[PDB]
Design a binder for this molecule. Structure first.
Ligand SMILES: CC(=O)N[C@@H]1[C@@H](O)[C@H](O[C@@H]2O[C@H](CO)[C@@H](O[C@@H]3O[C@H](CO)[C@@H](O)[C@H](O)[C@H]3NC(C)=O)[C@H](O)[C@H]2NC(C)=O)[C@@H](CO)O[C@H]1O
Ligand SMILES: [Cl-]
Ligand SMILES: [Cl-]
Length: 136
């Protein structure tokens, strides 16, 4: 599914993303915009390291979900699939699982810095435009 901007903002607000581990809803919106253009079925293979990015947030397979096909990995406990999900779950139209996984991502030290796209296009920028007029 390709979300409309305000429709996603209201969805994320309902799912408890506003202010989660200190990240404003606007930051999440900025992230989804630049990562996938708000498209849940987006996939990107990293030929360079054989990992794949999945869904609206472009979550990487090396540490967060299991796709079976991601090499460079020494798996301690749940270290290779910290969200406890098949990567397939990050490609559904319903973003509940994707959101639970993004929340797990930011529980690690880097927080939102986990996404290179955020560093480049969102950090220290006026992200208010992403949520203006959405009623959130
Ligand atoms: C959105 C996304 O998928 N982003 C990817 C990044 O998560 C990934 O960075 C690596 O993330 C893992 C998991 O957070 C890092 O490991 C954790 O590091 C902290 C540091 O103290 C430690 O507390 C955790 O125990 C440790 N976890 C594990 C499972 O080892 C890892 O250090 C990050 N690597 C770098 C270079 O920052 C990057 C790189 O694979 O890909 C993004 O796409
Ligand atoms: Cl699953
Ligand atoms: Cl699995």
């Amino acid at each position: 599914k390709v979300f409309e901007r305000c429709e996603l903002a209201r969805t994320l607000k309902r799912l408890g993303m506003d202010g989660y581990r200190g990240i404003s809803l606007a930051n999440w919106m900025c992230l989804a915009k630049w990562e996938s253009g708000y498209n849940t079925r987006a996939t990107n293979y990293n030929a360079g390291d054989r990992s794949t990015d999945y869904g609206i947030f472009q979550i990487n397979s090396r540490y967060w979900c299991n796709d079976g096909k991601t090499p460079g990995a020494v798996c301690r406990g749940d270290s290779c699939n910290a969200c406890h999900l098949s990567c397939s779950a990050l490609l559904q139209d319903n973003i509940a699982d994707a959101v639970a996984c993004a929340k797990r991502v930011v529980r690690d030290p880097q927080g939102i810095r986990a996404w290179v796209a955020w560093r480049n296009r969102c950090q220290n920028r006026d992200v208010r435009q992403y949520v203006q007029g959405c009623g959130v």
